[PDB]
Curated annotation (Swiss-Prot), chain B:
Homodimer in solution; homoheptamer in the host membrane. After binding to GPI-anchored proteins in target membranes and proteolytic removal of the C-terminal propeptide, the protein assembles into a heptameric pre-pore complex. A further conformation change leads to insertion into the host membrane. Secreted, cytolytic toxin that forms pores in host membranes after proteolytic removal of a C-terminal propeptide, leading to destruction of the membrane permeability barrier and host cell death. The pores are formed by transmembrane beta-strands and are approximately 3 nm in diameter. This is Aerolysin. Proteolytic cleavage and subsequent release of the propeptide trigger a major conformation change, leading to the formation of a heptameric pre-pore that then inserts into the host membrane. It comes from Aeromonas hydrophila. Belongs to the aerolysin family. It is found in: Secreted; Host cell membrane.
Amino acid sequence: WVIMGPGYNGEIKPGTASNTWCYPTNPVTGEIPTLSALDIPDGDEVDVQWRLV
Amino acid sequence: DGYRCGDKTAIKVSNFAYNLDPDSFKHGDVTQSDRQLVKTVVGWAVNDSDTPQ
């Protein structure tokens, strides 16, 4: 099979070319990495808000 | 031929009726029906031997 571009209305047809699409066959980090941690010191609720901000 | 050729737009019509009264209308030739009586009255007017009109 060969993928055709915009000029062919995006259709995909049988046949062969020389521009082969391939894929590394390896699992990847499909998520946001380890959320280490954040140490905020104790204080009044709004005081805490300030430190975050 | 063409991108998405086929299943092209179409025309549709709905709510298609309206008993409009635009005021101007015509009066054709008319005909008269048979005459008939409604309430009627009869009577007498009478005076006397010496009662000038």
